[PDB]
């Protein structure tokens, strides 16, 4: 009883929407898409290989991890969102507020992926350092945010007379960077960010799997789902290849003025899956220069929505504003807690009486999707039979491959992020970091209301 | 020691950005903007009046509310996001996980603004019904989601033999709708959604103020901030009028291809302020037809970002992708818990040693803003001296007025939401609701991978 | 409110063979009377009990209720007083009681060492969010207090707590590093009075703050101290306990009693004995007299606990060298009077249905009599109960007595020059700027590993 | 891993101190010392034999002892201090205030070694009789203080309807005395105080081992250290024999007017090791008569000091008062919780910044030792590499041997205590005990102030 995600691309096509994609459209790109799949098969990126050592190196720590009642991940972006996505999608929303008995002995997971002291302080107020493991995660080994939060955690351990080696696990490049040097000099336990895997493609590497295993997620089943997804993503038959289809259809639509991808998840536990997609799409495909060095300023802005909530926020705009969005719905059909709506005795509420609350949620997704179709707003749907590691591993793999394919189609490098470097340089200079000299000039025009 | 929000619109203008707005641009719209302000002054919408009864009717319940240790708001969109925005921005992030003593006797606030049973179940698992008040909030008195969650809460009270009148407070239109009838027939305590105030403009009405007061927020100071903001928003001098300036500059940019507003808050506690803005902007300004009945499909998609987090997700795209965004930063300069980064003894981290963690966060905002300027991406900044009710009330008022002004400039009705009605009709039909007959047709083209 | 009772009888002939005589008393009476008169005429600051000591501490009462725990970072004079007050005037499980059982008053922990097992164990028991650190140092730079201060402050900083909300500084009003910190950073503060040395400072804000925090009646503490200091100014030596303690101990020191044993018959009084230890040792253990002559004077104070140390030291006190004067502290009424149950066993009939304290008191009486019979000089200080009035009497009488002994021995009882060399060596070991002492390689090394 | 205690006797000798012991001094007593060691080897006292049955009898109760969460030792002196020495030195100071989980399942240990009702009542307020074992320990089987506390514990058990045999374990002489009778008549579990081992020499017998095993101390390792130390104590080469050297040097100094031994431990955890030593030295060596029946009134008063604390209490007197003391330091070089002193940013505290707090403690021991040397105060040092049962067993063994050797040198019986009997007789008479008739006479001279 493991099932493939189901994809329904029907509302992306004519005649389902007037303005839809056509058989001519598909034919216009089919060859370039098949070539993207072939290139993935022939020059497979490291992320798709799902090395056994990724699971094995994490399982090797399992006996040690059961010493801890909490794991705090000190990581950001690629080293933080995948942790939150796994945590939300694959444990109950009140996991960290459950007793240890309710958690069946597994650990609470907190992720500190910002340098806001209100965030760090609120996590620190919830943990006992004597029973906490900090997983310090940075590929580079020197991400400023992670250094700052590492410093705070280390300082607290020191002040309490706790051995940092008993409370910190370092996940970083096997050879380069400051955190790796710390490992080598001080003898920390460690895990690797694989050299050929970039942050935003690292969730199924030890980056994501350690905290997942800590909280009792079946990480083997997670890889089983991703494996099956990657295998379907290598099919040169595009009508059997969900990742190729996502790329094909989004590539075409980007070309036809759809500058926004909306991913709308009909589940509060899926919301961090959408944030993970946000970074994956935006950072991969949002590129100034193409592979030839030509200025292209390409990209499709990823927008996060939550159903049914955002029907009362964004659905007016999605139906009646500019037609610049392709909307992907994430639909889960079975819930771990199926609340039944009681009979209140009021005739006004008979349409709700003794139905599952999820029946209403699912009726809302269906109605929202249909209204959008009727208003010729292109949409597709990914359906999960439940929130299981198998299904979440599929999700990650399919979107990692699709993003890879879109970078091929757009003839850009989907695996770099040059646009982030300037802000960092300015910031380090502001922080007085040795060798950082950028000076922000005094402005001519100052338009302030103070 | 109450201070106005500071606005810096400088990076929206030439020469600060090449491509920026010009004095010619401002002159092109100045008159229409002054007229929007005059119209607001002369035909003031009910939301801007800040009726004393909004605070007084809530304070009248204060003695009763201190019976409860938890308030659960059963509301959605306009009746839910303002509650979450107040809760996050004006209490510590671990408020609901603090002891009652730590909360100084004030209540926990949970908001159930979805029909996902994983959400409702997780809140139900955290509360004792004997010490909980459900605030059921719907302007119409019949929002499906709110009916469903009301039914569940009522059913639990009944099964436990608790009197619903002792555990439910109804906030709805004073005269129309099912919830008002329930009030009248069964004798519930109640509060009003003011007839002339729409959901998305209702946060400073009893909709938002009840839960705020419950958790110990100074609701008087909240209105004091909003009052001062509304007064500045009635200034016909546009260079002294932050709301007029936001409208002026966003109107111009929408016209020049900036189809996205990004609001990027450098605070985890401000994140629900951004979601409140999301609904306010999208639902107000995302309109098919103008006031003349002409098809305009207007709108500017609001995008939520969090700094520094989203520097590792979206900043590549914001600097290097299409130039279709105006970015507003929210910057708070003082934090309730100022963590100091310890000295680790490592020369590599000297740039962080013994600085406030917030110094790094603030350096990151400044650097991110400068990089964007250098890449000619238009941006402005709203600076809060701290997270206080005064400053949050200002924020709400300024953006409510600015949205009002943009609807004038765009010559649409910013106070309706016709585009939501079709999805609801389809959903009710799917739910078998009497008199709802929409039938979804079988599709010609079915493109599925299953 | 009743006066401590003193019974000096077993210090005198014929009660002990070898005891003090009327001739002995006459030999020093005039010098003692002059000690008293000097105290009356040039009263040391500690004996003035300034109103501002209580008033400055009471000013913080409203603020202190924010905290469930006060941690005293202080050592010696700035630490033992707090412990003496804590143990003697609250039940032994006070810090392990619930807040309700404590009637809302705070837990008190004293970190008076730089052992990380001590600091760590206290930190493991506290919530920084509800903890006040009282950082106490007269000089403002005591190394041990700087070290513990640094740790507490670092924890406060890492958690984002404002140090001014969680630290109270007790130091000289004008001089020193801690006073500078107060003035530069705006900490709340209390004073160590300029003319009061650490070991004489328990009844100043040094001790009064943590005592108040835990709900001790500090007014009653001063009321007892006041009454005791009044009796200590009586020129009739037979009405003046402090003068009699100095008289008799001065005579015995001169007759080869090189040890004072203070043996308290109460586990709660044990830190009163430690406070006394520092007071007698550091005051009267002096190389030079007031003329600059080498005298190497001193009487080693020894801490004992009754009835416990009957099974540790009583063999030695009765059968070893006759070099000790033994002062008993006897408390006659206990806050929890446990009654020994009837077991039904004939062998235990002598215990059946008596107060456990009756056994304790019979043990003090028997121990005292056996020592008299063995001609070992002893006296007894009897408390009707462990109350602030009684404890304030105790501190005052002993502070006055130590002042008088310094007069009789013609030394300065208010300095401590012998501590400075070790500190200089230590700072040099710690690499402190301007400390250069180098410990030389030894000729003779006698090691077993 | 297991290391011998290191002894440094250097500052006991000339030229290290002027006035120090000389090679002539050593020659003066070498032969009598060698003869002490030989007597020990040839007529070994029962305490040094470390019978396997002392560990086995205690280990046979381990399954039963895990029923309890708390062991309360009712014993005094020899039957009480050893338990406290082991508890403090080999468990953290907050052991009894740790949760059961923090204690890894092992029991809390309270020792009630006084008939102060404030002691007993404070212990009783902390225990649940249903989960408590009272270990009632008296070699004689009739120690009054143990009878009284036994009576209290038993009465409580009775009045609650708990079976005393499920909550009391009796440790007493195998054949003689009231407690042994109780065992035989009522069927209590029991352990033996070995007939040839006196109380003050009983810590490593079941007297001490039971409570130690209950709190998780490795009692095998305790014996392994004691065994190695007793072996070194049987070496006729006095320069390889620590116990011989302690006895040699202290005997010489006692004869040169050092009437006081100061043991000053630089650890709050070692303070009860010092108290154990106090009873050992005082009760053994403080004798009126020698073995010939000649009046000697011999003895060296043992004084307890704690470093660094007592540098602010006693160090003035030790350096500047009578030169009547030999001072032994106990120095522990590694701590279980190694607190690092943070950097405060203050120039005044740069000599502390980022050093271990124990570096300061150790520097204080060294400086204190050197200043005492400079002032010609004889001192030695015992260095522990950590607080481990191996090191603590070594300590007890070496000091028990040393005391035996001192009694030989002093030609006294180190194994009796006739000076305690008079006080007991008087007390029993005051308590109205049948056959005790002592009458305290009215005094001639009464010198009282009331
Ligand atoms: Cl968004
Ligand atoms: Cl105040
Ligand atoms: Cl048995
Ligand atoms: Cl002592």
UniProtKB/Swiss-Prot annotation, chains A, B, D:
EC numbers, comma separated: 5.3.1.9
Annotated effect of mutating residue 283 to A/S: Loss of activity
Molecular function per GO: carbohydrate derivative binding; glucose-6-phosphate isomerase activity; monosaccharide binding
GO biological process terms, semicolon-separated: gluconeogenesis; glucose 6-phosphate metabolic process; glycolytic process
Catalytic activity: alpha-D-glucose 6-phosphate = beta-D-fructose 6-phosphate
Enzyme's top EC category: isomerase
Keyword Signal: no
Keyword annotations: Cytoplasm, Gluconeogenesis, Glycolysis, Isomerase
InterPro entries: G6P_Isomerase, Phosphoglucose_isomerase_CS, SIS_dom_sf, SIS_PGI_1, SIS_PGI_2
UniProt-annotated catalytic positions: 283, 312, 424
Family listed: Belongs to the GPI family.
Name of this protein: Glucose-6-phosphate isomerase
Gene designation per UniProt: pgi
Swiss-Prot record, chain C:
Annotated compartments: Cytoplasm
Keywords linked to the UniProt accession: Cytoplasm, Gluconeogenesis, Glycolysis, Isomerase
SUPFAM superfamilies xref list: SIS domain
GO cellular component, one term: cytosol
Pfam families reported for this sequence: PGI (PF00342)
GO biological process: gluconeogenesis; glucose 6-phosphate metabolic process; glycolytic process
Enzyme Commission designation: 5.3.1.9
Annotated active site: 282 (proton donor), 311, 423
Principal location listed in the UniProt entry: cytoplasm
CDD domains membership: SIS_PGI_1 (cd05015), SIS_PGI_2 (cd05016)
Highest taxon above the source species: Bacteria
UniProt similarity note: Belongs to the GPI family.
Protein's job: Catalyzes the reversible isomerization of glucose-6-phosphate to fructose-6-phosphate. Does not have phosphomannose isomerase (PMI) activity. Isomerization proceeds through a cis-enediol-based mechanism.
Assembly and oligomerization: Homodimer.
PANTHER family per the UniProt record, alphabetical: GLUCOSE-6-PHOSPHATE ISOMERASE
HAMAP family: G6P_isomerase
Protein name, entry field: Glucose-6-phosphate isomerase
Species this chain originates from: Thermotoga maritima (strain ATCC 43589 / DSM 3109 / JCM 10099 / NBRC 100826 / MSB8)
Gene this chain is encoded by: pgi
């Amino acid at each position: 009883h493991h099932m493939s995600l189901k994809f329904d691309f029907s509302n992306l096509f004519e005649p389902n929407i007037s303005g839809g994609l056509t058989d001519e459209d598909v034919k216009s790109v089919e060859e370039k898409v098949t070539s993207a799949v072939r290139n993935f098969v022939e020059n497979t990126p490291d992320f798709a290989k799902l090395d056994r050592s990724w699971i094995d190196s994490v399982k090797s720590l399992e006996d040690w991890i059961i010493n801890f009642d909490t794991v705090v991940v000190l990581g950001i972006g690629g080293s933080g969102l995948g942790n939150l996505a796994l945590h939300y999608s694959l444990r109950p929303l009140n996991w960290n507020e459950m007793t240890r008995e309710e958690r069946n002995g597994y650990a609470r997971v907190f992720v500190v992926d910002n340098v806001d002291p209100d965030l760090m302080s609120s996590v620190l107020d919830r943990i006992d350092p004597k029973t906490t493991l900090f997983n310090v995660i940075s590929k580079s080994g020197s991400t400023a945010e992670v250094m700052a939060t590492y410093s705070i955690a280390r300082g607290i351990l020191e002040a309490y007379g706790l051995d940092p080696r008993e409370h910190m696990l370092i996940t970083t490049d096997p050879e380069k960077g400051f955190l790796r040097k710390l490992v080598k000099e001080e003898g920390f336990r460690s895990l690797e960010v694989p050299p050929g895997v970039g942050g935003r493609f690292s969730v199924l590497t030890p980056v994501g799997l350690l905290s997942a295993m800590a909280e009792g997620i079946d990480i083997d089943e997670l890889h089983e789902g991703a494996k099956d997804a990657f295998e379907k993503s290598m099919k040169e038959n595009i009508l059997e290849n969900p990742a190729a289809m996502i790329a094909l259809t989004h590539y075409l639509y980007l070309n036809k003025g759809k500058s926004i991808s909306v991913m709308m998840a009909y589940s509060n536990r899926m919301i961090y899956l959408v944030d993970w997609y946000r970074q994956l799409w935006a950072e991969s495909l949002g590129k100034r220069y193409n592979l030839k060095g030509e200025e292209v300023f390409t990209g499709q802005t990823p927008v996060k929505a939550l159903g049914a909530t955002d029907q009362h926020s964004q659905i007016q705009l999605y139906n009646e504003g500019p037609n610049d969005k392709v909307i992907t719905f994430l639909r889960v059909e079975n819930f771990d807690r199926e609340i039944v709506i009681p009979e209140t005795g009021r005739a006004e509420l008979s349409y709700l009486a003794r139905k599952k609350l999820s029946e209403l949620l699912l009726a809302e997704q269906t109605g929202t999707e249909e209204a959008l179709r009727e208003n010729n707003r292109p949409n597709m749907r990914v359906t999960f039979d439940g929130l299981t590691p198998y299904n979440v591993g599929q999700f990650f793999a399919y979107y990692e491959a699709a993003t890879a394919f879109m970078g091929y189609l757009l003839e850009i490098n989907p695996f770099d992020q040059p646009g982030v470097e300037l802000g960092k340089k300015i910031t380090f200079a502001l922080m007085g970091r040795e060798g950082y000299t950028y000076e922000i000039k005094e402005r001519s025009k100052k338009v302030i209301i103070e």
